[PDB]
Write a protein that binds this ligand. Sequence first.
Ligand SMILES: *C(=O)CCCCCCCn1cnc2c(Br)c(Br)c(Br)c(Br)c21
Lengths: 7, 329
Amino acid sequence: XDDDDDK
Amino acid sequence: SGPVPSRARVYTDVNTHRPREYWDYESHVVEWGNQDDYQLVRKLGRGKYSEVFEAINITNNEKVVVKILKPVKKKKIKREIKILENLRGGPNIITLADIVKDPVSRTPALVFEHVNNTDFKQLYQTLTDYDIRFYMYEILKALDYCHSMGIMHRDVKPHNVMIDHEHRKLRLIDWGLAEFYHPGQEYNVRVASRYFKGPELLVDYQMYDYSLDMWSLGCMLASMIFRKEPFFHGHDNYDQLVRIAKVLGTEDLYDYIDKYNIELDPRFNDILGRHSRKRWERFVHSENQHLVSPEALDFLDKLLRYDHQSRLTAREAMEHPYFYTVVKD
Ligand SMILES: *C(=O)CCCCCCCn1cnc2c(Br)c(Br)c(Br)c(Br)c21
């Protein structure tokens, strides 16, 4: 990574 | 007022013609295996969402890779699992062999087929012009398949492409960010790694589609044929758009945001500047000249475009003259 998701 | 909507130009309505079970991953019931069948050998790494181990299936004595998920919303674990099951068996898709409950973390652990992967930093220094074309075509097979199954990968990058160079084997891995494409749906722009984020993410345009993966693949291609890893090396998400604008120019950037009635973050006011589009030959030199061709530059040019709607689809890309010299099968 280097960011993050939820949608 | 507000942004202009957007649709994928291909595979638009694939999910609405599937039964609800196919894409409604929240209601998916996970069929569990037996965690005792796997012994952990060594830890390969960890990110923010999981810990990854080389392991051994003790029954058949075969090597596997185990992805131990960190606690996250059940719908996200179910999303990754349902996408892996939907895509299982497809060309160059990593195979999900089993799902067990890790006794220590009490979270799901995904068991994957093993790939004798050589790290991309060492491997990419040895790839020939033919190898780049060959593996690019192999990646495109995986992207076209999952796009045709209504799924965006959303995290295409070298670290998510496992290559056994000794056996010409390639697998696309890490589907933890993948989503189903539903037309008109506004998605989270916080996907993909910084260097491979499409301009739609960087300008906060939420109604993107499969074409995001094609920008990220264009970034990989530019990095391989120019021997510059990564190609757009932003210091943060805002400098990342500046890095793109210094090659593609600000003119086409403003045309892009104007077409979709997007307003840039006003912090770009004093950093974005004015840049003309650069000709690709400026990045050619004696040390990468053998990887660059008229075909490679035309292909890259049709991938690295601001307007996501103007990029090549995966299926179109496989028709490009860049792949004429590659033997198929
Ligand atoms: C961002 O936080 C990235 C953290 C990435 C850690 C990657 C470790 C290597 N890895 C991950 N999954 C893998 C699979 Br599935 C297979 Br199969 C293999 Br061979 C490897 Br090396 C994997």
